[PDB]
Ligand binder design. Structure first.
Ligand SMILES: CC(C)(COP(=O)(O)OP(=O)(O)OC[C@H]1O[C@@H](n2cnc3c(N)ncnc32)[C@H](O)[C@@H]1OP(=O)(O)O)[C@@H](O)C(=O)NCCC(=O)NCCS
Ligand SMILES: O=C(/C=C/c1ccc(O)cc1)O[C@@H]1CC(C(=O)O)=C[C@@H](O)[C@@H]1O
Length: 434
């Protein structure tokens, strides 16, 4: 598919910004190392057919966007910084307003519909500017690219470095970028200081934090990527396979626990894991309302703690009910005490870059399932309308999956996932087999 770079320029903050070092919390430092690939799609028209082009005839005007960008780079000023170690080796952010990369591009021969279901395939990744990772102190924390398409359609490819923000804060920035570009003031100001997620003095962890321990191994084959939608009705059915035990007294399983158990099960069956094979499911968890007192809105960075349900495949593949209980218990266990204890625990390891989650974390027999269901991924209205889709621009690792809210409020959920190719073939036949 032919794509040309119309042009690229480093954008800089639209005012004075402190040239400080930013302390990175433990969570900021264990999330995966590179950039979070995100991709938006907008159509020139719809939903009825209405033209979305502005009065002034603009549709995603580069200059107007670089302008908002620069402005939003002021409160969110560390988005402009660079990665620096410290007097120890501990990665922190160097706020040096060295700017973010922005860049326009053209897809003259192809409509957006070329991407079909928008699976985070290899092809989709090209909508994002490529970074050179070989000098992590050099590359910008935020690369951007707005691609204009053969039928008036537009694609924003976002590449945000993990240390900087999680889905919540990252989307805070992007949505704020789109707010300015639309002529609206930022509703909530980023809190830049990540002091609130500092360990206790001295560290007193009360758990061994299974989430930071080495994933289970089997007692490299390239990976296929696909996306699977489950309607509100299918989700209902799946849920009904989970008998809400009256005699127990406990609350019903969350929808996540049910969907995740189903995915964990399909993945385990797809991979042909024998019954005694242990398997670990990684579930990124938002600590914003786990911690007490709650973090202040606008808190800027990662508040991601990790729930890792762990069981034998036999338990997981025996049914959704049994997997969901394991998952739901793992989740319920993430309270203020557990989260704060995880802070203390990370403060004790020597090199945190050994705890960074990567390919070793998520690959067979294990799994990651990251939910964006609660994230405002469809809020980015720059002035020309809400996107028709947003999701991961690629999936770096075999075994990693994402849950995505429906773009059109229809109550469906989509699962985007990378598996070994032979496993994916099976998985396609399993994921709806219920
Ligand atoms: C905790 C987690 C495992 C489940 O997230 P969730 O989708 O909010 O659902 P939870 O299991 O936390 O919460 C329990 C239920 O209360 C619901 N709920 C409670 N308050 C809510 C709110 N303010 N908005 C939306 N849903 C809410 C949840 O949707 C969930 O599902 P249900 O519809 O089946 O009841 C985890 O996915 C999470 O914290 N997600 C939030 C965003 C996130 O994690 N981002 C990570 C990307 S870096
Ligand atoms: O899910 C996020 C980030 C979300 C995001 C979304 C939009 C944006 O602009 C920035 C970040 O990161 C996640 C972090 C993670 C972990 O193990 O903690 C596993 C990965 O699956 C995810 O990539």
């Amino acid at each position: 598919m032919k794509i040309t770079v119309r042009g690229s320029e480093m954008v800089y903050p639209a005012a004075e910004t402190p040239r400080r070092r930013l302390w990175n919390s433990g969570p900021d430092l264990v999330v995966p190392r590179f950039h979070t690939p995100s991709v938006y799609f907008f159509r020139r028209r719809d939903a009825d057919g209405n033209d979305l082009t502005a009065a002034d005839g603009s549709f995603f005007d580069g200059a107007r966007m670089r302008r908002a960008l620069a402005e939003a780079l002021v409160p969110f000023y560390p988005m402009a910084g660079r990665l620096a170690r410290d007097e120890d080796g501990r990665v922190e952010i160097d706020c040096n307003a060295a700017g973010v990369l922005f860049q326009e591009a053209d897809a003259p021969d192809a409509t957006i519909d070329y991407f079909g279901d928008f699976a985070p395939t290899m092809e989709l990744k090209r909508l994002i500017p490529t970074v050179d990772f070989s000098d992590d102190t050099a590359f910008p924390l935020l690369v951007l690219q707005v691609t204009h398409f053969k039928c008036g359609g537009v694609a924003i490819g976002v590449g945000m470095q993990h240390h900087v923000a999680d889905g919540f804060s990252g989307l805070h920035f992007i949505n704020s970028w789109a707010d300015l570009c639309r002529g609206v003031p930022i509703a909530v100001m980023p809190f830049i200081d990540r002091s609130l997620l500092r360990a206790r003095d001295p560290p007193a962890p009360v758990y061994p934090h299974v989430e930071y321990q080495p994933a289970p191994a089997m007692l490299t084959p390239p990976a296929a990527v696909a996306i699977f939608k489950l309607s509100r009705a299918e989700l209902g059915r799946l849920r009904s396979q989970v008998p809400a035990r009256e005699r127990e007294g406990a609350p019903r399983f969350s929808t996540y626990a049910v969907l995740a158990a189903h995915v964990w099960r399909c993945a385990s069956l797809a991979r042909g894991l024998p019954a005694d094979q242990p398997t670990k499911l990684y579930c990124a968890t938002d600590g914003r309302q786990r911690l007490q007192p709650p973090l202040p809105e606008g808190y800027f960075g990662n508040v991601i703690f990790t729930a890792t349900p762990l069981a034998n495949a036999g338990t997981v593949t025996a049914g959704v009910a049994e997997g969901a209980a394991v998952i739901q218990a793992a989740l319920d266990r993430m309270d203020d005490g557990y989260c704060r204890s995880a802070l203390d625990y990370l403060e004790l390891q020597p090199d945190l870059s050994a705890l960074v989650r990567g390919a070793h974390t998520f690959r067979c027999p294990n799994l990651g399932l990251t939910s964006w269901v609660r994230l405002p991924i469809h809020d980015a209205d720059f002035g020309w309308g809400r996107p028709v889709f947003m999701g991961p621009g690629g999936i770096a690792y075999e075994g990693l999956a994402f849950v995505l809210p429906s773009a059109n409020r229809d109550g469906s959920l989509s699962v985007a996932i990378s598996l070994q190719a032979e496993h994916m073939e099976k998985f396609r036949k399993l994921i709806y087999d219920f």
